[PDB]
Tab-separated table of C-alpha atoms in Angstrom:
chain	number	residue	atom	x	y	z
A	1	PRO	CA	112.390	116.077	95.687
A	2	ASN	CA	109.806	118.887	97.188
A	3	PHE	CA	106.539	118.292	98.901
A	4	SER	CA	106.417	122.075	99.025
A	5	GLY	CA	103.023	122.764	96.914
A	6	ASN	CA	98.786	122.540	96.719
A	7	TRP	CA	97.125	119.214	96.476
A	8	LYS	CA	93.916	118.072	94.941
A	9	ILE	CA	93.513	114.354	95.760
A	10	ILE	CA	92.693	111.982	92.416
A	11	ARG	CA	92.691	108.535	93.729
A	12	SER	CA	91.448	106.788	97.081
A	13	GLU	CA	90.637	103.867	98.449
A	14	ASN	CA	89.804	102.303	102.044
A	15	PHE	CA	87.918	105.285	103.124
A	16	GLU	CA	85.101	103.813	104.973
A	17	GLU	CA	87.299	101.228	106.204
A	18	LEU	CA	88.938	103.775	107.720
A	19	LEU	CA	86.341	105.859	109.034
A	20	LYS	CA	84.780	102.763	110.616
A	21	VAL	CA	87.942	101.623	112.671
A	22	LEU	CA	87.929	105.313	113.753
A	23	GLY	CA	84.440	105.976	114.748
A	24	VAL	CA	82.106	102.924	115.442
A	25	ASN	CA	78.593	104.164	114.199
A	26	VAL	CA	77.565	104.115	111.047
A	27	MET	CA	76.545	108.113	109.801
A	28	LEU	CA	79.418	108.824	111.835
A	29	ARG	CA	81.261	107.280	108.330
A	30	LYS	CA	79.050	108.558	105.779
A	31	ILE	CA	79.697	112.316	106.709
A	32	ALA	CA	83.340	112.011	106.758
A	33	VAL	CA	83.027	110.126	103.122
A	34	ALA	CA	80.681	113.123	102.152
A	35	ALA	CA	82.739	115.741	103.765
A	36	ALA	CA	85.862	114.575	102.043
A	37	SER	CA	84.023	114.699	98.560
A	38	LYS	CA	88.148	114.918	97.146
A	39	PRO	CA	89.292	116.880	100.079
A	40	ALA	CA	92.107	119.682	99.194
A	41	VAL	CA	95.496	119.887	101.080
A	42	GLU	CA	98.873	122.144	101.329
A	43	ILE	CA	102.235	120.891	102.029
A	44	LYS	CA	104.894	123.151	103.257
A	45	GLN	CA	108.624	121.847	103.018
A	46	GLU	CA	111.359	123.947	105.306
A	47	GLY	CA	113.836	120.779	105.049
A	48	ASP	CA	113.251	118.022	107.255
A	49	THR	CA	109.855	120.083	108.407
A	50	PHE	CA	106.731	119.259	106.786
A	51	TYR	CA	103.887	120.921	107.731
A	52	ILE	CA	100.574	119.906	105.907
A	53	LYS	CA	97.392	121.878	106.199
A	54	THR	CA	94.354	119.823	105.097
A	55	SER	CA	90.653	121.565	104.060
A	56	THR	CA	87.459	119.858	103.299
A	57	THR	CA	84.640	122.938	102.989
A	58	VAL	CA	83.595	122.239	107.091
A	59	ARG	CA	86.446	120.962	108.617
A	60	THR	CA	90.401	122.090	108.560
A	61	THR	CA	93.195	120.133	109.955
A	62	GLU	CA	96.960	121.176	109.590
A	63	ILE	CA	99.886	119.050	111.349
A	64	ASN	CA	103.779	120.054	111.582
A	65	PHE	CA	106.622	118.146	112.498
A	66	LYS	CA	110.569	117.247	111.855
A	67	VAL	CA	111.783	114.262	110.183
A	68	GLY	CA	113.648	112.836	113.618
A	69	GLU	CA	111.767	113.970	116.405
A	70	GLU	CA	108.055	113.151	118.066
A	71	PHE	CA	105.185	116.105	118.308
A	72	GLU	CA	101.882	116.673	118.707
A	73	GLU	CA	99.563	117.139	115.821
A	74	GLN	CA	95.621	116.609	115.054
A	75	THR	CA	94.583	112.999	113.562
A	76	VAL	CA	92.506	112.300	110.562
A	77	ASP	CA	88.999	111.698	112.868
A	78	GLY	CA	89.250	114.806	115.367
A	79	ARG	CA	91.283	113.584	118.106
A	80	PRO	CA	94.892	114.974	119.321
A	81	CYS	CA	97.850	112.238	118.903
A	82	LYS	CA	101.537	113.191	119.324
A	83	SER	CA	102.726	111.958	116.021
A	84	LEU	CA	106.346	111.030	114.391
A	85	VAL	CA	108.040	111.024	111.105
A	86	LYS	CA	111.415	109.334	109.678
A	87	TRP	CA	112.880	108.797	106.128
A	88	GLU	CA	112.829	105.812	103.805
A	89	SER	CA	114.239	107.053	101.103
A	90	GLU	CA	115.193	110.225	99.067
A	91	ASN	CA	111.921	111.806	99.095
A	92	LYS	CA	109.644	108.365	101.173
A	93	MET	CA	109.348	108.805	105.154
A	94	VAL	CA	107.011	106.881	107.471
A	95	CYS	CA	105.315	108.124	110.097
A	96	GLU	CA	103.850	106.686	113.478
A	97	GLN	CA	100.912	108.011	115.820
A	98	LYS	CA	99.840	107.536	118.936
A	99	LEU	CA	96.488	109.532	121.231
A	100	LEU	CA	97.700	112.220	123.767
A	101	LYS	CA	95.444	111.175	126.116
A	102	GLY	CA	93.259	107.492	126.714
A	103	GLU	CA	94.281	104.853	124.475
A	104	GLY	CA	92.221	102.394	121.347
A	105	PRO	CA	93.162	102.130	117.991
A	106	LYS	CA	96.859	102.814	116.198
A	107	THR	CA	97.002	105.292	113.499
A	108	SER	CA	100.297	105.464	111.190
A	109	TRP	CA	100.673	107.104	107.693
A	110	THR	CA	103.311	107.932	105.129
A	111	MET	CA	104.161	110.106	102.172
A	112	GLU	CA	105.862	109.604	99.248
A	113	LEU	CA	107.118	112.373	96.856
A	114	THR	CA	107.278	111.042	92.715
A	115	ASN	CA	110.591	111.608	90.700
A	116	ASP	CA	108.273	114.501	88.799
A	117	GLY	CA	107.243	116.016	91.777
A	118	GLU	CA	103.711	114.644	92.357
A	119	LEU	CA	102.450	113.553	95.996
A	120	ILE	CA	101.068	110.482	97.447
A	121	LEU	CA	99.917	109.507	100.733
A	122	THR	CA	99.288	105.683	102.462
A	123	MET	CA	97.484	105.883	105.794
A	124	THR	CA	96.997	103.061	108.453
A	125	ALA	CA	95.267	102.397	111.405
A	126	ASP	CA	95.321	99.465	113.318
A	127	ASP	CA	95.513	96.984	110.814
A	128	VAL	CA	93.617	98.843	107.673
A	129	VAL	CA	95.111	101.492	105.215
A	130	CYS	CA	93.635	104.618	103.678
A	131	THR	CA	95.621	105.507	100.668
A	132	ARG	CA	94.925	108.546	98.519
A	133	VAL	CA	97.270	109.996	95.597
A	134	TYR	CA	97.617	113.656	95.440
A	135	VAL	CA	98.519	115.905	92.476
A	136	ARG	CA	100.181	119.318	92.909
A	137	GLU	CA	96.671	121.782	92.614
C-alpha cells in the first residue's frame, strides 16, 4: 500500500510496439528502446497525490497529480498531455491521457502496488499496452 520509493524495472513487453504507435518512423523506435535499457524511476506518494520521475540516461520525465482531478504532465514519447487518475482497488489506480494540443492517438496507463510493496505499471496507447514490472530499487 505504498508506491513511494525508487524503482528499477525487471521485466517488460510491448516496448517496440508502443514506440511504433507513439511515433511512426523506424529508427525513432530503436532509439527509445536503446534509450530505455532498463530505465529507473522514483515515485513520491503524498496521499492521493502520486508523483513519478523516470530517468534513462539522456532523458528524464516526471509527472505529478491527485486521484480525482485532471492535470497537465508529460507522456512517454515527449509530448504534453493532460492525464487523470482514479482508484480501482486499495492500491491499484487507472489513468486516462489526452494531448493538450492537436489530436491523433490516445494514451492511458495504470499502476498497481503489491501486498509486499512492489510496484508494477501497465500502459496503453490506442489499442496497444506497454507493461513493465518495477521492483523498489
